[model samples]
Target chain A: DHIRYDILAQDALRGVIRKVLGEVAATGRLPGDHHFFITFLTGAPGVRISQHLKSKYAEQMTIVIQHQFWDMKVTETGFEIGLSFSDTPEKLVIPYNAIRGFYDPSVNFELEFDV
Target chain B: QDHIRYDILAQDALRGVIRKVLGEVAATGRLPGDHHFFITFLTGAPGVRISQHLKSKYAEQMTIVIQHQFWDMKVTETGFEIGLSFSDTPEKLVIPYNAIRGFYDPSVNFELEFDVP
Candidate 1:
């Protein structure tokens, strides 16, 4: 009789993620001393990433959007941010659903959720 | 109000529950009564180490049970490591809490699901 009563709670959890991203998207800045470690599923549909990255990760990957990023934007479905690879800049569009973990170890804070 | 980061705090608390349950099992060296855990997690997520066979089978999500036949169950401050039998072969699993998507206990009819988004 394991009734999975976590549906509503999980939605509220994602809302918190969107809230922070929306704030940074509007300000183009991260809060003081704040950084993020974001892990996402590359195999999930609608997850836009390059073939170069796809070939390497194939299934899942993590990216940090902090300290040195630009062109941050948030929409109803996902987010857009700039990141660097081997000194080359790249822009990625990631929907919220693809994300698996969101954490900022500075505060020992973390989030793990269903994909 | 200020920089609470309630999302992070709340999740840490949730993971604590998983740790507490596993801790109890490790301490007792047996699952009390018919209690068992069905843990769902991402096989490809960071810090997730499992046999290559399992990785190939569950490219994304994997659910394992902690029941009568599991061995070498160890609980650390960060995660859990356990050995379970697969196809008459023993396979070890190293899973961090962040990789988990669901935790359920059928004995009590209780379940919790997570959002990987």
Candidate 2:
């Protein structure tokens, strides 16, 4: 189970994201700025977003998840949330793997995943 | 795709943990702990937004915070927005995940500092 623990270490880390999101889904109480700073390949297979969006931030993109988010759902495969843009509510679907970076400046924590 | 790039899976997973911790702070003002992350990143990285002066001041790389001085933080799907004062000037910065170069939480006795490039 610990082979290529580099990858193993990676999985263990990914577990944290799952755990937190699971908690939020269960608590029904917002974690507030407990938000994510994720940079991912916009065209990645598991990512879901609008074309107009892709056209704008093409290739790589990041989204904020502060208090403005709603209907945030987390599952084994990925997570989905409703975010506001201008006056419209947009939905974003992101799989854990699609992410290249995750950060929370609130505590000076950061992660950059590159092989 | 092996579910995700192994590195990203791990990175994102760990970031989620940070997300959990910070949300706790903003929501209730708690750290459960701290960090001294010497986050150094290319200030010019695309999608990396900073005040024009701050951006111009740092040519290649910029190191920030003793884990101090920032406000009105809002988290995001891929990053977080923060309000910071530069040269006594107030500014809010939106930092993305990839723009980050490191993470260190000493009280937790954990560190995963890496190259931002």
Candidate 3:
């Protein structure tokens, strides 16, 4: 029987994103110009976003977590973050499993997962 | 305010990938399909144990293939212990996850690098 390395790898890698966001949430700042471009499945279970974002992004949405973001709350299985959409403040709650992409351009590091 | 260390976090998480894979293999007592591994580790790293002869030969580091004839594979929270043959002589190696510098699976051309700090 073959162990599904793909599933194990994805879960483990998502753990990294969770840990990074947890740290950022604790510190209230991103360290050393590090920012993330996070993309997630809008229709995935446990994903909470605005109607406007859902209509605009449709299936997936990519958000920049650099400047002008606030109140990032990382949970055991998900996270909620505040971002401005077209100058309107919005709050998004996303589960780690819903994430399809996570990238930190400062370090040229990225993780991609199947939706 | 202190900045979050994403690099470190990612590295640690990736290590968990290795741990999970090895643990599954150990539990099943087989490498599924053509999925073999080329694991390179630092011999001098703490918690790493290899034969003194191999230490002298490999010096700082060594890479081993986990294919057809490995034995007694066991994985723990921080490391793994496995039996491998060295020059036709069976030898055991205890390697901590932190000591591994690289892991590659040629079957899928998948690889991960961990440069020690």
Runs of candidate 2 exceeding 4 Å displacement:
B1-117
Predicted structure 2: lDDT: 0.63
Instruction: Report per-candidate DockQ.
Output: 0.04, 0.08, 0.46
Task: Evaluate model 1: give its lDDT.
Answer: 0.78
State the displacement of the C-alpha of residue B35, model 2, in Å, after optimal TM-score superposition. Answer: 33
- Between which residue pairs do clashes occur in model 1? A99-B116, A113-B115, A113-B116, A114-B114, A114-B115, A114-B116
Give the CAPRI class of candidate 2. incorrect
| Candidate 3 to truth, TM | 0.85
TM-score of each: 0.51, 0.46, 0.85
Error of 1 at A89 (Å): 2.7
Top model by DockQ, which number? 3
Cα lDDT tens digits, model 1, B7-115, are 5645666666777778877777788777889999988888888988889878799899998799888888768898998888899999988888999888877776766
lDDT of 2 by residue, A16-53 (tens): 66666656666655464455676777788888999878
Alpha carbon lDDT of residue A4, candidate 2? 30
In candidate 3, which residue ranges exceed 4 Å CA deviation? A84-89, A105-109
How do these models rank on TM-score, best leading?
A: 3, 1, 2
Q: A9-50, model 1: which lDDT tens digit per residue?
A: 455566667777788778887777777888989878778888
Per residue, candidate 2 scores C-alpha lDDT tens digits across B39-101 of 455677666778878888788677655256767767677766666677898876766666766
